[PDB]
Protein backbone atom coordinates (compact mmCIF):
# COMPACT_ATOMS: atom_id res chain seq x y z
CA UNK A 1 0.00 0.00 0.00
CA UNK A 2 1.15 4.00 -0.99
CA UNK A 3 1.81 6.02 2.10
CA UNK A 4 3.78 9.52 2.06
CA UNK A 5 6.41 10.69 3.95
CA UNK A 6 7.27 14.89 4.00
CA UNK A 7 10.04 16.71 5.31
CA UNK A 8 9.68 20.32 7.04
CA UNK A 9 10.19 21.81 3.40
CA UNK A 10 7.24 20.21 2.05
CA UNK A 11 9.44 17.76 -0.30
CA UNK A 12 6.95 14.70 -0.19
CA UNK A 13 8.27 11.49 -1.48
CA UNK A 14 5.84 7.95 -1.55
CA UNK A 15 6.45 4.81 -0.52
CA UNK A 16 4.97 1.55 -0.68
CA UNK A 17 4.54 -0.52 2.24
CA UNK A 18 2.45 -2.88 4.45
CA UNK A 19 1.17 -2.81 7.62
CA UNK A 20 3.28 -5.32 9.47
CA UNK A 21 6.54 -3.36 7.81
CA UNK A 22 8.30 -2.14 10.77
CA UNK A 23 9.43 1.27 11.43
CA UNK A 24 12.86 0.38 10.52
CA UNK A 25 11.73 -0.88 7.38
CA UNK A 26 10.42 1.91 6.58
CA UNK A 27 13.34 4.20 6.93
CA UNK A 28 15.35 1.66 5.03
CA UNK A 29 12.93 2.46 1.94
CA UNK A 30 13.36 5.90 2.57
CA UNK A 31 17.13 5.74 2.50
CA UNK A 32 17.08 3.51 -0.86
CA UNK A 33 14.78 6.37 -2.22
CA UNK A 34 16.21 9.52 -1.07
CA UNK A 35 19.67 8.53 0.38
CA UNK A 36 19.03 9.89 3.65
CA UNK A 37 20.74 7.39 6.80
CA UNK A 38 18.47 6.14 9.06
CA UNK A 39 20.45 7.36 11.88
CA UNK A 40 19.27 11.19 10.99
CA UNK A 41 15.46 10.31 10.59
CA UNK A 42 12.82 11.14 12.93
CA UNK A 43 9.51 9.77 11.54
CA UNK A 44 6.65 11.36 13.34
CA UNK A 45 2.72 10.41 12.94
CA UNK A 46 -0.24 11.56 14.96
CA UNK A 47 2.18 13.53 17.55
CA UNK A 48 4.29 10.48 18.32
CA UNK A 49 7.66 9.71 16.84
CA UNK A 50 7.61 5.99 15.98
CA UNK A 51 9.70 3.68 16.97
CA UNK A 52 12.16 1.60 15.18
CA UNK A 53 10.75 -2.29 16.54
CA UNK A 54 6.96 -1.51 15.84
CA UNK A 55 5.00 -1.63 12.79
CA UNK A 56 2.74 0.68 10.81
CA UNK A 57 -0.02 -1.59 12.09
CA UNK A 58 0.73 -0.36 15.47
CA UNK A 59 0.35 2.96 15.11
CA UNK A 60 -2.97 2.52 12.83
CA UNK A 61 -1.25 3.90 9.46
CA UNK A 62 -3.47 3.48 7.14
CA UNK A 63 -3.35 3.71 3.41
CA UNK A 64 -2.33 7.02 2.51
CA UNK A 65 -1.07 8.27 5.47
CA UNK A 66 1.62 11.07 6.16
CA UNK A 67 4.41 10.40 8.08
CA UNK A 68 6.34 14.01 8.84
CA UNK A 69 10.11 13.46 8.22
CA UNK A 70 12.69 15.51 10.50
CA UNK A 71 15.89 15.33 10.30
CA UNK A 72 19.27 15.46 12.38
CA UNK A 73 19.28 16.99 16.15
CA UNK A 74 18.64 20.54 16.05
CA UNK A 75 16.61 22.57 18.90
CA UNK B 1 -19.49 -2.69 24.92
CA UNK B 2 -17.61 -1.58 28.62
CA UNK B 3 -15.08 0.58 26.91
CA UNK B 4 -15.27 1.94 22.75
CA UNK B 5 -12.97 4.46 20.90
CA UNK B 6 -14.50 8.00 22.10
CA UNK B 7 -12.93 9.32 18.12
CA UNK B 8 -14.04 6.01 15.89
CA UNK B 9 -16.72 3.95 18.28
CA UNK B 10 -14.94 1.09 17.50
CA UNK B 11 -15.30 -1.93 20.24
CA UNK B 12 -12.37 -2.16 22.42
CA UNK B 13 -13.29 -4.93 24.10
CA UNK B 14 -11.56 -7.21 22.08
CA UNK B 15 -8.33 -5.70 21.93
CA UNK B 16 -5.25 -7.96 22.42
CA UNK B 17 -4.46 -6.09 25.13
CA UNK B 18 -4.69 -2.87 27.08
CA UNK B 19 -1.34 -1.29 25.64
CA UNK B 20 -2.91 -1.70 22.33
CA UNK B 21 -6.25 -0.85 22.76
CA UNK B 22 -5.18 2.40 24.11
CA UNK B 23 -1.96 2.20 21.52
CA UNK B 24 -5.41 2.47 18.83
CA UNK B 25 -7.01 5.57 20.63
CA UNK B 26 -3.87 7.79 20.62
CA UNK B 27 -3.38 7.11 17.21
CA UNK B 28 -6.79 9.40 16.34
CA UNK B 29 -4.35 12.55 18.36
CA UNK B 30 -5.19 14.94 18.39
CA UNK B 31 -9.09 14.30 18.19
CA UNK B 32 -10.61 12.96 21.68
CA UNK B 33 -14.16 13.24 20.00
CA UNK B 34 -16.11 12.01 17.53
CA UNK B 35 -15.18 13.74 14.22
CA UNK B 36 -10.30 14.22 6.89
CA UNK B 37 -7.32 12.87 7.49
CA UNK B 38 -5.25 14.84 5.47
CA UNK B 39 -6.62 17.77 7.89
CA UNK B 40 -4.86 16.17 10.43
CA UNK B 41 -1.59 16.17 8.83
CA UNK B 42 -1.47 19.86 8.02
CA UNK B 43 -2.41 20.84 11.51
CA UNK B 44 0.08 18.49 12.28
CA UNK B 45 2.53 20.09 9.37
CA UNK B 46 2.34 23.39 10.95
CA UNK B 47 2.27 22.77 14.10
CA UNK B 48 6.44 21.47 13.63
CA UNK B 49 7.18 23.85 11.07
CA UNK B 50 6.28 26.55 13.97
CA UNK B 51 8.45 24.43 16.63
CA UNK B 52 11.23 24.25 13.83
CA UNK B 53 10.95 27.87 12.61
CA UNK B 54 11.35 25.98 9.37
CA UNK B 55 8.16 28.33 8.39
CA UNK B 56 10.87 31.09 7.91
CA UNK B 57 7.93 33.21 10.03
CA UNK B 58 9.44 36.52 11.73
CA UNK B 59 12.98 37.03 12.66
CA UNK B 60 15.53 38.77 15.57
CA UNK B 61 14.63 41.98 15.03
CA UNK B 62 10.97 41.96 14.67
CA UNK B 63 10.44 39.60 17.90
CA UNK B 64 13.26 42.03 19.34
CA UNK B 65 10.53 44.80 18.48
CA UNK B 66 7.64 43.14 19.76
CA UNK B 67 8.68 41.45 23.17
CA UNK B 68 10.81 44.92 24.26
CA UNK B 69 6.93 46.32 23.58
CA UNK B 70 5.24 44.33 25.66
CA UNK B 71 7.62 44.50 28.39
CA UNK B 72 7.06 48.22 28.21
CA UNK B 73 3.69 47.66 27.97
CA UNK B 74 4.02 44.92 31.03
CA UNK B 75 5.19 47.69 33.13
CA UNK B 76 9.11 45.54 33.11
CA UNK B 77 10.71 47.85 30.59
CA UNK B 78 10.92 51.78 30.89
CA UNK B 79 10.40 53.89 27.70
CA UNK B 80 13.96 54.83 28.06
CA UNK B 81 15.08 51.39 28.83
CA UNK B 82 12.95 51.14 25.63
CA UNK B 83 15.40 53.56 23.05
CA UNK B 84 18.56 52.89 24.78
CA UNK B 85 18.04 49.05 23.97
CA UNK B 86 16.37 50.26 20.34
CA UNK B 87 19.74 52.05 19.26
CA UNK B 88 21.95 49.77 21.11
CA UNK B 89 20.68 46.73 18.84
CA UNK B 90 20.39 48.55 15.49
CA UNK B 91 24.01 50.20 16.26
CA UNK B 92 25.40 46.83 16.87
CA UNK B 93 23.03 45.27 13.96
CA UNK B 94 24.85 47.42 11.22
CA UNK B 95 28.10 45.97 12.28
CA UNK B 96 26.84 42.30 12.29
CA UNK B 97 28.07 42.60 15.99
CA UNK B 98 25.90 40.92 18.92
CA UNK B 99 24.99 43.81 21.18
CA UNK B 100 26.32 42.49 24.54
CA UNK B 101 22.87 43.01 26.15
CA UNK B 102 22.67 39.52 27.54
CA UNK B 103 26.47 38.68 28.68
CA UNK B 104 27.26 37.79 31.22
CA UNK B 105 31.82 37.94 31.63
CA UNK B 106 33.99 35.99 33.32
CA UNK B 107 32.35 32.80 34.09
CA UNK B 108 35.87 30.63 34.65
CA UNK B 109 36.83 32.57 37.47
CA UNK B 110 33.96 32.92 38.92
CA UNK B 111 33.17 29.12 38.43
CA UNK B 112 36.41 28.01 39.71
CA UNK B 113 36.03 29.94 43.21
CA UNK B 114 32.83 28.51 43.86
CA UNK B 115 33.85 24.65 42.61
CA UNK B 116 37.02 24.63 44.26
CA UNK B 117 35.77 25.54 47.93
CA UNK B 118 32.60 23.51 47.68
CA UNK B 119 33.28 20.79 50.12
CA UNK B 120 32.31 17.69 48.28
CA UNK B 121 34.62 18.66 44.92
CA UNK B 122 38.07 17.76 44.38
CA UNK B 123 38.92 18.44 40.74
CA UNK B 124 37.74 21.38 38.90
CA UNK B 125 38.51 21.14 35.88
CA UNK B 126 37.38 24.21 33.25
CA UNK B 127 37.81 25.42 29.79
CA UNK B 128 40.42 28.59 29.16
CA UNK B 129 37.47 31.38 29.64
CA UNK B 130 34.06 32.16 28.44
CA UNK B 131 31.60 34.17 28.39
CA UNK B 132 27.50 33.18 28.87
CA UNK B 133 25.32 34.42 26.22
CA UNK B 134 21.28 34.43 27.44
CA UNK B 135 18.63 34.42 24.60
CA UNK B 136 17.07 37.51 25.08
CA UNK B 137 13.77 39.56 23.87
CA UNK B 138 14.56 38.63 19.94
CA UNK B 139 15.41 34.33 19.96
CA UNK B 140 14.02 33.24 23.33
CA UNK B 141 12.09 30.10 22.25
CA UNK B 142 14.64 29.31 19.14
CA UNK B 143 17.83 30.98 19.35
CA UNK B 144 19.87 28.48 21.73
CA UNK B 145 22.35 26.67 18.85
CA UNK B 146 23.19 30.62 18.23
CA UNK B 147 23.77 31.66 21.77
CA UNK B 148 26.03 28.65 22.33
CA UNK B 149 27.83 29.11 19.25
CA UNK B 150 28.81 32.88 21.02
CA UNK B 151 29.96 31.48 23.38
CA UNK B 152 32.14 29.11 21.81
CA UNK B 153 33.32 31.81 19.79
CA UNK B 154 33.75 34.72 23.06
CA UNK B 155 36.66 31.46 24.15
CA UNK B 156 38.04 30.83 20.79
CA UNK B 157 38.90 35.00 20.22
CA UNK B 158 40.94 34.74 23.06
CA UNK B 159 43.26 32.50 21.49
CA UNK B 160 45.43 34.20 18.57
CA UNK B 161 45.31 31.54 16.00
CA UNK B 162 42.11 30.89 16.20
CA UNK B 163 41.29 34.43 16.11
CA UNK B 164 43.05 35.23 13.19
CA UNK B 165 40.71 32.66 11.17
CA UNK B 166 37.53 34.04 12.97
CA UNK B 167 38.05 37.49 11.77
CA UNK B 168 37.95 36.39 8.58
CA UNK B 169 34.01 36.73 8.98
CA UNK B 170 34.23 40.22 9.00
CA UNK B 171 35.05 40.44 5.38
CA UNK B 172 36.58 43.99 4.85
CA UNK B 173 35.11 45.80 7.99
CA UNK B 174 37.01 46.29 10.88
CA UNK B 175 35.80 45.94 13.88
CA UNK B 176 37.53 45.72 17.55
CA UNK B 177 39.17 41.87 16.84
CA UNK B 178 36.99 40.43 20.30
CA UNK B 179 33.72 40.91 18.23
CA UNK B 180 31.19 37.82 18.52
CA UNK B 181 28.83 38.20 15.50
CA UNK B 182 25.00 38.73 16.07
CA UNK B 183 22.40 35.83 15.59
CA UNK B 184 21.56 37.81 12.14
CA UNK B 185 25.56 37.66 10.97
CA UNK B 186 25.72 33.90 11.78
CA UNK B 187 22.32 33.14 9.97
CA UNK B 188 24.44 34.93 7.21
CA UNK B 189 27.52 32.98 7.14
CA UNK B 190 25.81 29.50 6.80
CA UNK B 191 24.08 30.75 3.86
CA UNK B 192 26.75 31.66 2.79
CA UNK B 193 28.74 28.40 3.62
CA UNK B 194 26.24 26.79 2.74
CA UNK B 195 26.37 28.06 -1.08
CA UNK B 196 29.66 27.60 -1.40
CA UNK B 197 28.95 23.40 -0.85
CA UNK B 198 29.55 23.37 2.84
CA UNK B 199 26.89 20.55 3.73
CA UNK B 200 24.70 20.62 1.10
CA UNK B 201 22.63 17.50 2.71
CA UNK B 202 22.28 19.87 5.74
CA UNK B 203 21.30 22.53 4.01
CA UNK B 204 18.58 21.20 1.96
CA UNK B 205 16.89 20.21 5.43
CA UNK B 206 16.35 24.09 6.39
CA UNK B 207 15.21 24.84 3.29
CA UNK B 208 18.65 26.85 1.98
CA UNK B 209 17.54 29.51 4.24
CA UNK B 210 18.75 31.02 7.77
CA UNK B 211 18.84 34.98 7.27
CA UNK B 212 15.63 36.23 8.91
CA UNK B 213 14.12 33.63 10.43
CA UNK B 214 13.74 31.83 13.73
CA UNK B 215 14.82 28.66 11.96
CA UNK B 216 16.17 26.12 15.01
CA UNK B 217 19.79 24.58 14.26
CA UNK B 218 22.37 21.58 15.58
CA UNK B 219 25.43 20.47 15.93
CA UNK B 220 26.02 20.24 11.97
CA UNK B 221 25.21 23.86 11.55
CA UNK B 222 27.82 24.30 14.28
CA UNK B 223 30.30 22.46 12.06
CA UNK B 224 29.59 23.78 9.05
CA UNK B 225 30.20 27.64 9.97
CA UNK B 226 33.56 26.88 11.47
CA UNK B 227 34.47 24.93 9.25
CA UNK B 228 33.72 27.81 6.67
CA UNK B 229 36.01 29.56 8.55
CA UNK B 230 39.11 27.13 8.24
CA UNK B 231 38.76 25.92 11.56
CA UNK B 232 38.96 22.18 12.65
CA UNK B 233 36.07 19.98 14.50
CA UNK B 234 34.95 17.14 15.60
CA UNK B 235 31.34 15.54 15.95
CA UNK B 236 30.89 13.16 18.04
CA UNK B 237 27.38 11.47 18.34
CA UNK B 238 26.15 9.97 21.79
CA UNK B 239 23.90 8.28 19.90
CA UNK B 240 22.21 6.05 22.71
CA UNK B 241 22.75 5.82 26.50
CA UNK B 242 25.32 3.41 27.58
CA UNK B 243 24.84 3.34 31.13
CA UNK B 244 21.70 2.06 33.62
CA UNK B 245 18.53 3.51 33.94
CA UNK B 246 19.00 5.52 30.18
CA UNK B 247 22.51 7.51 31.57
CA UNK B 248 25.40 8.44 28.98
CA UNK B 249 28.51 7.29 31.16
CA UNK B 250 30.69 7.52 28.42
CA UNK B 251 29.64 10.98 27.30
CA UNK B 252 31.04 11.98 31.00
CA UNK B 253 34.46 9.91 30.62
CA UNK B 254 34.66 11.68 26.86
CA UNK B 255 34.39 15.16 28.63
CA UNK B 256 36.36 14.37 31.32
CA UNK B 257 39.30 12.96 28.88
CA UNK B 258 38.44 16.58 26.82
CA UNK B 259 39.29 18.54 29.89
CA UNK B 260 41.73 16.66 31.26
CA UNK B 261 43.86 18.38 28.14
CA UNK B 262 43.48 22.00 30.71
CA UNK B 263 45.55 21.50 33.46
CA UNK B 264 48.35 21.87 31.24
CA UNK B 265 47.49 25.83 30.60
CA UNK B 266 47.12 24.76 27.26
CA UNK B 267 43.82 26.92 25.41
CA UNK B 268 40.94 24.32 26.10
CA UNK B 269 37.76 25.81 24.51
CA UNK B 270 34.16 24.76 25.78
CA UNK B 271 31.97 22.41 24.26
CA UNK B 272 28.78 22.54 22.21
CA UNK B 273 26.12 20.74 23.23
CA UNK B 274 22.99 19.39 21.66
CA UNK B 275 19.88 16.97 22.51
CA UNK B 276 16.29 17.30 20.25
CA UNK B 277 14.88 20.46 21.40
CA UNK B 278 17.55 22.27 23.37
CA UNK B 279 21.44 22.66 22.60
CA UNK B 280 24.11 24.12 25.48
CA UNK B 281 27.38 24.86 26.33
CA UNK B 282 29.79 22.20 28.37
CA UNK B 283 32.28 24.89 30.33
CA UNK B 284 33.93 22.15 32.12
CA UNK B 285 33.68 18.97 34.48
CA UNK B 286 34.04 18.75 38.80
CA UNK B 287 35.40 15.09 40.21
CA UNK B 288 33.71 14.57 43.15
CA UNK B 289 34.89 12.99 46.36
CA UNK B 290 33.36 9.82 45.75
CA UNK B 291 34.34 9.79 42.05
CA UNK B 292 31.97 10.40 40.55
CA UNK B 293 31.87 13.02 37.10
CA UNK B 294 29.45 16.33 37.39
CA UNK B 295 29.44 18.56 34.40
CA UNK B 296 29.46 22.19 34.56
CA UNK B 297 26.55 23.48 31.89
CA UNK B 298 25.77 26.95 30.87
CA UNK B 299 22.66 27.30 28.93
CA UNK B 300 20.97 30.52 27.50
CA UNK B 301 17.92 29.97 29.01
CA UNK B 302 19.88 30.73 32.49
CA UNK B 303 19.14 34.44 32.45
CA UNK B 304 21.90 37.50 33.31
CA UNK B 305 19.91 37.63 36.50
CA UNK B 306 20.42 34.41 37.22
CA UNK B 307 24.30 33.90 35.77
CA UNK B 308 24.91 37.30 38.10
CA UNK B 309 24.76 35.14 40.98
CA UNK B 310 27.77 33.60 40.73
CA UNK B 311 29.70 37.20 40.82
CA UNK B 312 27.38 38.04 44.13
CA UNK B 313 28.35 38.91 47.61
CA UNK B 314 26.59 35.46 48.76
CA UNK B 315 24.63 33.21 46.33
CA UNK B 316 27.43 30.98 45.29
CA UNK B 317 27.83 27.27 46.86
CA UNK B 318 24.12 26.34 45.89
CA UNK B 319 23.90 28.82 43.25
CA UNK B 320 26.25 26.42 41.36
CA UNK B 321 23.40 23.85 41.21
CA UNK B 322 21.92 25.71 38.88
CA UNK B 323 25.08 24.73 36.43
CA UNK B 324 25.74 21.22 37.62
CA UNK B 325 24.44 18.14 35.70
CA UNK B 326 25.25 14.48 37.08
CA UNK B 327 24.64 11.26 34.82
CA UNK B 328 21.29 11.14 36.70
CA UNK B 329 20.47 14.42 35.19
CA UNK B 330 21.59 13.85 31.09
CA UNK B 331 18.86 11.44 30.53
CA UNK B 332 18.19 12.46 26.94
CA UNK B 333 18.43 9.18 24.61
CA UNK B 334 20.81 10.81 22.65
CA UNK B 335 23.26 14.01 22.99
CA UNK B 336 25.72 15.29 20.07
CA UNK B 337 28.86 17.58 21.19
CA UNK B 338 31.00 19.49 18.79
CA UNK B 339 34.58 20.06 20.28
CA UNK B 340 36.94 22.41 18.57
CA UNK B 341 40.44 20.69 17.74
CA UNK B 342 42.64 22.75 15.35
CA UNK B 343 42.41 24.39 12.11
CA UNK B 344 42.04 23.35 8.48
CA UNK B 345 45.55 24.01 7.09
CA UNK B 346 45.06 23.35 3.23
CA UNK B 347 42.55 23.58 0.14
CA UNK B 348 42.36 19.95 -0.15
CA UNK B 349 41.07 19.18 4.09
CA UNK B 350 38.86 22.83 3.51
CA UNK B 351 37.43 21.15 0.26
CA UNK B 352 36.75 17.54 2.20
CA UNK B 353 35.57 19.09 5.01
CA UNK B 354 32.44 20.33 2.98
CA UNK B 355 30.73 17.01 3.78
CA UNK B 356 30.20 17.30 7.45
CA UNK B 357 31.83 13.33 9.57
CA UNK B 358 30.69 12.62 12.94
CA UNK B 359 31.76 10.12 15.29
CA UNK B 360 29.59 7.40 16.61
CA UNK B 361 30.22 6.39 20.33
CA UNK B 362 29.51 3.78 21.05
CA UNK B 363 30.87 2.63 17.63
CA UNK B 364 28.68 0.49 15.63
CA UNK B 365 29.87 1.62 12.25
NA1 LIG C 1 11.30 35.57 8.42
NA1 LIG D 1 21.66 21.20 38.10
ZN1 LIG E 1 -10.72 4.76 17.10
Given at each position: ??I??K??????????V???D???????????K?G??????????????????????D?????E????L???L?? | ????????????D????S??????????F??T??????????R????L?????M???????????????????AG???????????????????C???????????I?????????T??????????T???????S????????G??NM????????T?????ER?????????????????????????????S???D??????????????R???????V?????????????????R????????P???????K?????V??????????????????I???????????????????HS?????Q???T?????????????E??????????????????????????????????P???
Amino acid sequence: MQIFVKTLTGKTITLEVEPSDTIENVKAKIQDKEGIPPDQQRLIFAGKQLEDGRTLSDYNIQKESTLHLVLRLRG
Amino acid sequence: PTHSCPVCGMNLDNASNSESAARHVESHFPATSPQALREREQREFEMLRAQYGMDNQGNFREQSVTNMQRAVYAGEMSVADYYERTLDLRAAESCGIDDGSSITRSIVPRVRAISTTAPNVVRTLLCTCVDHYASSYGDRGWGCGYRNMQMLISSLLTHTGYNERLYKLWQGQKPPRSSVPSISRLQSLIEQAWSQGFDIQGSEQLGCRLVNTRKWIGATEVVTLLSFLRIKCQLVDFHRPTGPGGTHPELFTWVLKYFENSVGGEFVPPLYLQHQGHSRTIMGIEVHRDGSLILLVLDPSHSPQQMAQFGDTNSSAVALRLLRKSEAAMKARQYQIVAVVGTIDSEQQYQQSKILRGTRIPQDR
